Structure formats: structure tokens, C-alpha cells
Design a protein around this ligand. Structure first.
Ligand code: HEM
Ligand code: HEM
Ligand SMILES: Cc1ncc(COP(=O)(O)O)c(CNOCC(=O)O)c1O
Ligand SMILES: *Cc1c(COP(=O)(O)O)cnc(C)c1O
Lengths: 500, 500
């Protein structure tokens, strides 16, 4: 054998109405976890179901909206369930022997799950991931001891250089290596059929009207839907597919004028073998802008520290569940954590750079003082001192001159930092410094320079990283107009709105 | 007025032996949580107790070593317990009213917990955090809607510029604002006494011989130790304090040169009111190098995606628990998650820059091929094509000349990217491009240039971010000597390993 296509038609003869006895598959029943877990892999599953309290109401939902929070799994994603299940079944099968090598083509989360289990169980782990996936995924994979290979983001799945193609190529060169293959492996949807779906039914007391889930491999939606069609046939199954992907039906939904997208984990250029599209009642297409808008809303309004595809899911859910009435219930799957996207959608700079926040239209929720300039604060000219000054002479000069702080500026005009009366006194009284010592241990070295013409909004951002902003002269660096801290900005804002 | 010292002596009349009936505090009994959580704040507590299987044995421990994993709480840390309890108690005692302002001096984790609860409950949240704390904490705080103020890392606690001093100064300027004050609030150690400690006892069947906990506010170790001294008196309480802090006893342990350190959340320049050192049996001084070495070891060997102070705790535990025999049990508290330190200890560049990792220890464990040069791969000079070539002509020339890929190089010598036979054919068969089209839609624009003199170790790092490495000449107009992928390095290593 050279390669097995990830989109080959499924040979599963499952049909709704067919009893469980007829299944050729091994089904693992959820097991009572002991008081002390023997390893972290037992902390995969039994994820919380949390009511959404603000977002549903905001978008006019009448029904109850609940979120299945899969980011609480050991590795931080829903994929920890399939990572563990694929390994356990392969071990039981005799396929995976001790110390063997696991190679897996992944968008990140299956790779993390497999790398975590490989770290614990003692397997060599090689992950093949497209170039677009976050550096935070790489960082965690490296820490877990996984070897990482990258493939071009725009490589077609059936090309030699796709993540799938490269994984098979590496397996062919490494003896004792296996590709568990999440795109074809029944252990993927069966993990969701046996556990994720059983948890949802248990948590809902078997009463559920709608399920919304984003689609990558299709294991989550397939596993959950097959079980729900058997146990709760009245539950409508809603699939979420990004614009650029071809998973959605009817095919008319996939005719778009763009092929790439920023959201990670969902959508493909092929139909994975594990995806059963017949069990999905309706599909909705999502875009990056609404996915990141909703992910940021989930964090800001619900405190759910989830990722991009979780935003895509809730963005669809508020449209899809509009038809539900009071008393009815909609469940959404939140697949992964914000950890994977710290420097991506979590960053306003990244959102702006990608055009997902219109800066001009963002200024509508910005305070009245945001666009005012630094000079309007009424800056007090500060006294400056040389770095050669003693701790004792610093106390003398600040008290003699009536200042509580002083920037330290050398003979060449370089601003070295700040010294305060309070800190110098506290350090002296605690014996940290002697009066004759130089100010080296007491000086506050970190500060940001700002112009008289900079905005107060710029100042506000600066004050989230530094304690003080030093207002300088563009033509005389040694010349400091003022020292501004968060307290000065508050005093200004408060005084202005205590008289108008 | 204006401020109450966070180190004022405790007025608590608790003493070991006093019946719980004499406590004047409110005590919450942990109760079963509902199937569906009304909000994410209910996902605080009931944290896992996980057996440490490799690290303990590696350092010669005979006892069982267990980890109480607090990073599974809603906000990612142990502090989510105290954030919720401080708010709940303040609401119940009438001090905190709907829509009031919460201001808190924090190292980050209490701020995250409070910001999460404030986002859910609808309170304005202002965090005052030292400059050393990670930018990852700032990014999560921003996403939750908290306002962020920073203070100098080297500001003495009693100076006006400390995180506690600034929080009080802000409160005095904001009407209807409150400082819950984790340094003096009984709700901090009470959260641990009522819930964390009872969980540890439930999980251990009331039988454990040693508890190791790192110390910041002291709420965790004080709450747990007061309950453990009452219900498991044989348990040894071990406190972990970083070098640079003054919390440890005897004072002789604290006679260190420096007072600054990279580990976050532990150690202080004052004794917090909530810290009861009389219930700590022994202190150990930890350092940054061992804290990060152990946090990386916990990830790599145990799959525990924890933070820096978790590493400090386990670094001490493998020393403190040496006195225990086979059959005894040591429990460590792992306070937060790796999410807060993505670009800090998780990064090898940061570790190198800080001196916690040396090129010597970085090498040794490196494979035999690591220091070989790219030139030793035995590169083949590739066929290059112009960017004006058609998709049809690309198929023809690659097949005709016997190549599977070609760099695209313009007449000025600029490398635009790569084209492949496989991707071009798949694109054509799927109707993405027409034979007469130029290759703009198929070209792989992302690649990394490498030199013939660079090492295979450098190539390996490059291959964790890019699929293609193009070997070039610094003197000629970017003339390509060869194209390398992860398959090409594996082919070189595997063939040479057969000869060896
Ligand atoms: C109880 C009813 C079911 C029957 C009678 C059935 C039957 C089969 C048969 C005959 C095969 C081909 C042999 C093989 O690959 O093992 C198969 C494959 C498979 N089954 Fe099932 N199955 C059932 C339920 C399920 C469920 C609930 C899932 C979802 C989690 C599932 C997922 C799969 C997958 C993904 C394959 C792989 C297809 C391939 O290799 O092309 N099956 N099934
Ligand atoms: C034997 C039982 C206890 C007695 C008689 C006791 C008594 C007191 C009293 C009289 C106060 C003064 C303020 C107030 O009444 O609210 C107090 C404060 C305090 N208690 Fe309790 N307490 C007991 C147990 C605990 C426990 C189990 C903890 C948690 C580990 C705790 C932590 C504190 C703290 C941190 C303070 C703040 C000290 C201050 O007000 O400056 N106490 N306690
Ligand atoms: C963030 C995220 N959301 C959503 C999903 C979609 O889940 P499913 O593939 O089960 O439909 C995934 C799964 N991506 O494909 C496997 C992988 O992580 O390597 C995902 O990672
Ligand atoms: C606060 C904190 C600690 C110390 O716990 P306390 O309850 O404050 O003693 C340890 N680790 C981290 C990361 C924390 O932020």
C-alpha cells in the first residue's frame, strides 16, 4: 500500500432504525473516574454544559441556549476525545505496539491531543500541520515533545505536499510508524457517538430541540447526530461550514468568490470518509468576520475562553435557532480554547491588520476623551536629576523642591528612568539602600516616551503596559514636559465630567 | 485613611484545637452542581487530583506524588475560587451592589478571575498589575473587559506606586468602587479552607502525608493547612517561596542578593494579613531556573499544561518528599495554566535570552546530524520557471524534464514561490484553473531561504514553520542550489542510519 485517500466513500452500513447489536464496532461505555486519576488522559470527557445568558437574548432567541464547553479537556479541545480513542482502539487492535511512532495530518488540535497522549504513554509523535495554523499550536506541540512538519495552506488534499499526502510519505520512510488517520478512522465519530452524545443526553435529561456544530473531519457532528437521531429524533442537526469549504449541502451554498480563510479547524476541500452528511438536517455557511466577532463576544459577555470555530458555531446558532420557541432548547459545541489564538483574533492589532474590525466604525463605542491630546492634561514640568545622585541627596532635593518624583537624565540627555520620594524613603527605611548609594536599585527603568501631540487613547493603551508615560520634546530629548500615569488620566476624566 | 496596609497583623483568633462552632465567619459547604451550569462561574472547583508517574520516580521519590490541578477552573487558575468567593460574600453582606466597581491589586490570576466574574455579573473591573506580569494576562484581561493599570516591579509595597498603593488611590477617585483585597479578605483563605481542602481530603480518603504549596497571598496554604491540621494532623505543610521574597521562615533562608525574579504569582516584600505562617511546617526557597525546568518537565513528561509556580512547587516537592517512604503520599498544588506564559518559559528563545537554558544543555541531547551542513544533503539544482508560465506549460515542462516541482523566479532573479506537478494537476482537474491561465492562483508563495552553510538543526527548526526551504547564494541574484522539505531530511537521516 502507498496511500489511502481521506475522502473514499464510507463502507458503513449504519441506518437509522437498525439496532446496536448489529454494529461490528467496539463501543466503550463511559466509565466512573476514580478519586485520583492515574494520569491526565482521564481528564478528557465529561465537559460542562453551560447556559448562554446574554448572547441569545441579544440576538432575539426565545429558547434556552446551552454551550458544551470542550475546551476544558486536558489538551484544551474536543479532539482530545478522538486522540485518546484512536490510540486506545489501535492498542487493543494490536496495530499500535509500545514505543511505536504516531504520525498524524492535523489542523492542530488532534495533533496536540495525540502529542499529549504520546508524551504520557511513551510514543514517538510526528505532526503534519498546514502553514496557516497558529504558532501557539506549534509552541504546545514542541513542549509536548512532538516533531513538527508543515505543508502549504493552499495545497490541494490529493497533491503530494498536502498535510495528508506528506503524512503518508513520512510513514513510508519510518519503520514502526502508524497513521491513525482521523479522516477515515471510525474511532473518531465513535468517540462522539459513545461519549460526547451520551453526555449531552445525560445533561439535557434527554430533552433537546436543536444541536449546532461546526464541521472539520465531521466526526463530532456525525457521532452526535447518529446517536441523537436514535435517542432524540426531534432534535434538529445544524452543520456549520466556512465560506471556502465544500462540506455543506446543497452544493449551491459553496459557490463563493474566495478560497482561503483565517478560522482554524473547520472546512475542507474534500468530504472526509467519517462525515455522514445524510444525518445533517441543515447547513449554514460562516465567515471569518462573524466567527471572530462572536468568539470575542463569548469571552466578553459569557466569560467563555473559547476559540475561533466556537464563534462560528454561536454566530450560526443565533440565526438557526430563531424558529425555536420559549421552553425549547438549543445546544452548541464549543470546540477549543483561546490559548491557540493569543496572537491571532485575541489581538486587536491582528484583527485590524486582517480587516475584521473597521477602525473608523469602532470609534463609535470610544470615550469622549479618546481623541483629545496629551498636552490638554495640564502637565507639570518635572525636576530632573543626574544618575550620579545619591539616595540621600535624592530625598533632600525632592523634599526641598517640593516634588514627589524626578526623571533621571544623564549628561548626554538620555532619559534613564524615574526615582520617587516614596520609594526612595521606603527603600532607605527598610535598609535596602544606604544614603550614600547611587540610585541603581531604586530607579524605575521602564517607561514609554510620548509626544505632546499624541492622543489620550494612545496614552490609555500605553498605560496597560507601563506605569508612566514621559512627555518629551521632539528636538530636545533631555527635555521632559511632564510625567503621566493612570491616576493623572483618571483625575482629568473625572474632573471634566463632574461639572458638565 | 486613604489605605489599609496589606501586611497589618491578623486579628483572627483561630488557634488549632478551637471547634468550628466558634468561628465567626460564614462557611460554605461544597454541594453537588447541576447538570446544566447556570453560568461559567459554577465551573470553579472540583478540580482533578492526578498521579505524577515519571517525575517523582526520576528524582528517587518512594511515595506516591499527586497533583491538585487548579488550572482546570473557568479562568485557568486556583484564583478563580477566591475571586468568586470574595464577590459572593461581598454581595451577601451588602457591600457590593449591582453595577458597582471592583478594583484589585493583582499579579494577574486574581484579576482574571475577578474580570471573568465581573463580565458575567455586570460589574466594572479595574486591575492594577506589576509591570513584570506576562502580556498573555493583559490580553485575557482586555478580552474580558477589564481596565488595566500597571505598576513598577521594583516598587516597594508601601510606596504610592505599588500595585496595592495605586489600587487604593484609584478607589478614592471612583465613586461606588470597592477593593475586595485578597491580602486581607478572609474570603481568600476561607475559600480554600471550605472547598479546596475538603476536595483534597475527599480525593485522598483523608489520608495524605505531605502537602506542598507555593505562596503568594498565602490564602491557599493557610486555608488548606488550617483544615488539614484539623482533619489530617499528621500531614506536613511545606511552603514554597521564591529567592527574592521574604515570606519564608526562618529569616535566614531569605538572605539573598537580588529581590527580582521571573516566576509569577509567588513571593512578596511583605507578609500578607491572610498568611498564617504558624501552620507551615517547613519552607523551601525556589529559584527561576528550577521552576521553568520543572514546568517544562511537567508538560513534557506528564502532559500537565501548567504554569511557572507549578514548576516551583514540584521542584521543591522532589526534595521535601525524600523523607517519605513507599506507601506514603505527597500532594502538590499546581496553581495556573501554560496559557499565561506562551511567549515566556514556553519559548526556547525566551529561556535562552534569560539564561535559563544554555547552548551546552541545548546540545548533547541533539541527534548526530544536528551540526551537519545543508550542503551535506547532496542537493540537486532545480529547474526554475518564469511567473508568466501557463498552468498547462508547467505540467508539460515538469513531466518532460522529469521534475515534480519548480521554484518560480522572475527575470530580475526574485524568487516568487514554488509550483508542483501534483497541485497544478489537481487544480486543473477540479476546475480551479484553466490551461491557459498564469500560475498566480496555484503558486505556493510561502517559503524560507536557507544557506548551504547553515546546519541541519537550523533546517529542522525552519521546517517547523515552513514546508519549503530554498537553498540560495548570498553573492549571486538569489540563485537556487536546491529545494529541501522535511521528507528530504528524513531521507538523508534514514539512508545514513542504514549505512551506520
Ligand atoms: C450499529 C450500526 C452500524 C453498522 C451495522 C455499521 C457497519 C459498518 C461496516 C460493515 C463497516 C465496514 C467495515 C469497517 O470499516 O469496519 C463500517 C465502517 C465504518 N463505520 Fe460503522 N456501522 C455502524 C455504526 C457506526 C457508527 C455509529 C459510526 C459512527 C461513529 C460508524 C462509523 C464508521 C466509519 C467511520 C467506518 C469506516 C468506513 C471505511 O472504512 O470506509 N459506524 N461500519
Ligand atoms: C477557630 C475559629 C476562628 C475564630 C474564632 C476566628 C475569629 C476571627 C475574628 C474574631 C476575626 C476578626 C474579624 C471578624 O470578626 O470578621 C477574624 C478574622 C480573620 N479570620 Fe477568622 N477565625 C476563625 C477561623 C478562621 C479560618 C478557618 C480562617 C481561614 C483559613 C480564618 C481567616 C481569617 C482572616 C484572614 C481574618 C482577617 C484578619 C483581620 O481582620 O485583620 N479564620 N477571625
Ligand atoms: C477548533 C476546531 N473546531 C472544530 C473542529 C471540527 O470538529 P470535527 O472535525 O469533529 O467536525 C475542529 C477539528 N479539526 O480537525 C481535527 C484537528 O483538530 O486536527 C477543531 O480543531
Ligand atoms: C496567587 C498565585 C499563587 C499563590 O497562591 P496564594 O493563594 O496567593 O498563596 C501561586 N501561583 C500562581 C500562578 C498564583 O498567581
Amino acid at each position: 500500500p502507498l496511500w489511502i485517500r481521506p475522502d473514499a466513500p464510507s463502507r458503513c452500513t449504519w441506518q437509522l432504525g437498525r439496532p446496536a447489536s448489529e454494529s461490528p464496532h467496539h463501543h466503550t461505555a463511559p466509565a466512573k473516574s476514580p478519586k485520583i486519576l492515574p494520569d491526565i488522559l482521564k481528564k478528557i470527557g465529561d465537559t460542562p454544559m453551560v447556559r448562554i445568558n446574554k448572547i441569545g437574548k441579544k440576538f432575539g432567541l426565545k429558547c434556552e441556549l446551552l454551550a458544551k464547553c470542550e475546551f476544558f479537556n486536558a489538551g484544551g479541545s474536543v479532539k482530545d476525545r478522538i486522540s485518546l480513542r484512536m490510540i486506545e482502539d489501535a492498542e487493543r487492535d494490536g496495530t499500535l505496539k509500545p514505543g511505536d511512532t504516531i504520525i498524524e495530518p492535523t489542523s492542530g488540535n488532534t495533533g496536540i491531543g495525540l502529542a499529549l497522549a504520546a508524551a504520557v504513554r511513551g510514543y514517538r509523535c510526528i505532526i503534519v500541520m498546514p502553514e496557516k495554523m497558529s504558532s501557539e499550536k506549534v509552541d504546545v506541540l514542541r513542549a509536548l515533545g512532538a516533531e513538527i512538519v508543515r505543508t502549504p495552506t493552499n495545497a490541494r488534499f490529493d497533491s503530494p505536499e498536502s498535510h495528508v499526502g506528506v503524512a503518508w510519505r513520512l510513514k513510508n520512510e519510518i519503520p514502526n510508524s502508524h497513521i491513525l488517520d482521523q479522516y477515515r478512522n471510525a474511532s473518531n465519530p465513535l468517540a462522539h457517538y459513545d461519549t460526547t452524545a451520551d453526555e449531552i443526553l445525560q445533561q439535557c435529561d434527554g430533552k433537546l430541540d436543536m444541536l449546532v456544530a461546526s464541521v472539520g473531519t465531521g466526526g463530532t457532528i456525525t457521532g452526535i447526530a447518529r446517536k441523537l437521531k436514535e435517542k432524540c429524533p426531534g432534535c434538529r442537526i445544524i452543520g456549520v461550514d466556512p465560506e471556502g469549504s465544500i462540506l455543506a449541502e446543497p452544493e449551491e451554498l459553496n459557490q463563493t468568490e474566495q478560497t482561503t480563510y483565517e478560522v482554524e479547524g473547520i472546512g475542507y476541500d474534500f468530504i472526509p470518509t467519517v462525515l455522514d452528511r445524510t444525518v445533517v438536517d441543515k447547513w449554514f455557511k460562516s465567515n471569518d468576520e462573524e466567527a471572530f466577532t462572536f468568539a470575542r463576544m463569548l469571552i466578553a459577555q459569557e466569560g467563555l475562553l473559547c476559540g475561533g470555530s466556537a464563534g462560528s458555531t454561536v454566530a450560526v446558532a443565533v440565526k438557526a435557532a430563531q424558529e425555536l420557541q420559549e421552553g425549547q432548547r438549543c445546544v452548541v459545541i464549543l470546540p477549543d480554547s483561546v490559548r491557540n489564538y493569543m496572537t491571532k483574533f485575541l489581538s486587536d492589532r491582528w484583527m485590524l491588520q486582517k480587516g475584521f474590525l473597521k477602525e473608523e466604525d469602532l470609534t463609535e463605542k470610544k470615550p469622549w476623551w479618546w481623541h483629545l491630546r496629551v498636552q490638554e492634561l495640564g502637565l507639570s514640568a518635572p525636576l530632573t536629576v543626574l544618575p550620579t545622585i545619591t539616595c540621600g541627596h535624592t530625598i533632600e532635593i525632592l523634599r526641598e523642591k517640593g516634588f514627589d518624583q524626578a526623571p533621571v537624565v544623564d549628561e548626554a540627555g538620555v532619559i534613564l528612568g524615574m526615582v520617587t520620594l516614596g520609594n526612595m524613603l521606603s527603600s532607605l527605611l527598610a535598609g535596602k539602600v544606604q544614603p550614600s548609594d547611587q540610585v541603581g536599585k531604586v530607579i524605575y527603568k521602564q517607561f514609554k516616551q510620548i509626544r505632546l501631540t499624541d492622543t489620550l487613547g494612545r496614552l490609555s493603551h500605553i498605560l496597560e503596559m507601563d506605569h508612566f508615560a514621559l512627555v518629551v520634546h521632539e528636538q530636545q530629548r533631555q527635555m521632559v514636559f511632564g510625567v503621566v500615569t493612570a491616576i493623572d488620566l483618571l483625575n482629568f476624566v473625572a474632573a471634566q465630567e463632574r461639572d458638565q
